[PDB]
Amino acid sequence: VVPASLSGQDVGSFAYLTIKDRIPQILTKVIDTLHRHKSEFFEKHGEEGVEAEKKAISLLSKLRNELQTDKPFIPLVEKFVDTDIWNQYLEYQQSLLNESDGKSRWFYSPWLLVECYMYRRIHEAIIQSPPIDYFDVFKESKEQNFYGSQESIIALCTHLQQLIRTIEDLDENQLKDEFFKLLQISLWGSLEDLKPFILLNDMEHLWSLLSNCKKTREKASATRVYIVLDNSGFELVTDLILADFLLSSELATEVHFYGKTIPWFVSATTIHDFNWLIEQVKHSNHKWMSKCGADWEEYIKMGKWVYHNHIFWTLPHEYCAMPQVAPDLYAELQKAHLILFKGDLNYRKLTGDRKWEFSVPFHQALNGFHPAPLCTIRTLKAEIQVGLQPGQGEQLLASEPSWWTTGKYGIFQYDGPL
Numbered sequence: 405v406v407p408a409s410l411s412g413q414d415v416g417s418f419a420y421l422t423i424k425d426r427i428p429q430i431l432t433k434v435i436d437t438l439h440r441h442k443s444e445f446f447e448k449h450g451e452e453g454v455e456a457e458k459k460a461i462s463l464l465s466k467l468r469n470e471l472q473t474d475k476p477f478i479p480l481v482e483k484f485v486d487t488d489i490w491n492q493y494l495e496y497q498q499s500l501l502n503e504s505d506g507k508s509r510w511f512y513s514p515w516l517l518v519e520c521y522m523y524r525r526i527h528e529a530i531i532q533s534p535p536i537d538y539f540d541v542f543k544e545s546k547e548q549n550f551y552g553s554q555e556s557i558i559a560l561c562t563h564l565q566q567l568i569r570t571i572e573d574l575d576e577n578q579l580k581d582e583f584f585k586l587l588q589i590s591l592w593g594s595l596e597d598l599k600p601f602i603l604l605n606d607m608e609h610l611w612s613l614l615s616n617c618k619k620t621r622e623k624a625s626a627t628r629v630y631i632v633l634d635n636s637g638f639e640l641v642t643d644l645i646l647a648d649f650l651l652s653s654e655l656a657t658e659v660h661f662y663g664k665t666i667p668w669f670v671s672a673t674t675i676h677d678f679n680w681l682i683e684q685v686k687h688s689n690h691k692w693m694s695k696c697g698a699d700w701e702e703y704i705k706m707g708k709w710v711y712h713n714h715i716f717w718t719l720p721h722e723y724c725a726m727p728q729v730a731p732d733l734y735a736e737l738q739k740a741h742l743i744l745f746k747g748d749l750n751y752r753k754l755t756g757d758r759k760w761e762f763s764v765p766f767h768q769a770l771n772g773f774h775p776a777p778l779c780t781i782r783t784l785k786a787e788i789q790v791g792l793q794p795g796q797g798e799q800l801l802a803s804e805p806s807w808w809t810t811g812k813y814g815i816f817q818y819d820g821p822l
């Protein structure tokens with residue numbers, strides 16, 4: 405049995421607040437972005453870039469008004485690789501509603517469906533609008549984040565390369581301390597001052613699993629670490645940096661990355677962001693960024709790093725449906741020795757975005773999804789968190805009602821052996 409989905413039915417919930425005030429703000433910014441790109445669209449495509457820009461804006465304005473007025477969802481129309489799968493899911497989701505529930509709609513349906521539907525409607529508007537059907541309405545924002553974090557990127561790249569020089573000479577506890585440090589940088593995006601906000605910490609399980617694979621690794625056999633990515637800019641750098649350490653420390657022999665097929669939840673990494681960012685680091689004029697960038701493209705060339713694109717990550721489906729909806733992806737995940745899931749949306753999809761009580765075990769919240777040993781590295785931006793000690797979440801709600809939606813708290817929450 406599984407609890408109800410978080411939704412905008414509870415007018416006191418964060419999902420309500422989010423659908424009511426924040427999703428319209430996202431769409432307005434997107435419309436602004438297309439407006440501000442008029443001149444660029446003209447230079448590159450002539451009058452018809454401008455007509456396409458106006459066409460897309462109208463459609464996104466229609467999409468906003470549906471949200472504002474709680475109109476029922478309509479089917480997806482433009483041909484695309486996941487259009488039919490989407491419509492099947494919508495039909496299935498309507499089937500879950502009884503007569504009294506009416507039709508799937510913005511303020512009634514599961515918050516997870518509501519948000520993923522919205523971004524997929526954004527993408528439909530764009531691909532409906534050639535010749536700008538390539539546009540990434542979030543790319544300007546994602547490139548800005550990279551440019552605004554040059555110092556931290558420089559500092560992290562510098563730290564990593566200093567470490568690489570010495571790495572051979574490290575004691576296994578010294579290596580473990582470096583690994584925990586990089587896991588913490590991967591979580592937060594100073595560490596001693598943030599340590600009180602780690603409310604669940606299974607980093608020891610990550611160490612035990614990986615160091616045993618390393619000790620017992622007989623030659624020509626692989627330790628695969630998969631990273632299911634979240635954001636671009638500095639957050640992706642922290643994940644690239646962690647992956648590099650994983651290889652340089654021989655805790656892994658291959659790292660596999662998964663991103664999003666389409667622009668998603670604003671800042672989430674697509675294949676174009678992944679490649680663009682590694683390019684900028686490689687062709688940086690800073691000594692340690694460039695060396696990192698060269699190493700990373702070299703990793704990709706040798707198959708030590710592999711980037712994967714799969715449609716499932718931009719479907720509305722909970723991860724419990726992956727065996728049936730994307731069996732090839734589940735089968736691939738089963739080749740991992742450890743899967744790291746970054747960020748809040750991955751946590752929501754791993755736990756169904758349901759109203760679990762605080763004490764429910766993570767294993768049970770996963771609702772059958774156990775491809776391989778896995779751990780969610782996540783800052784809390786949603787009203788859901790399982791695996792807590794009794795009274796722990798209750799105490800936080802009483803002391804700061806906002807605690808699990810501000811991104812202030814983080815977890816390393818592991819499912820697997822030991």
Ligand SMILES: [Mg+2]
Pocket residue numbers: 501502503506
């Ligand atoms: Mg009905």
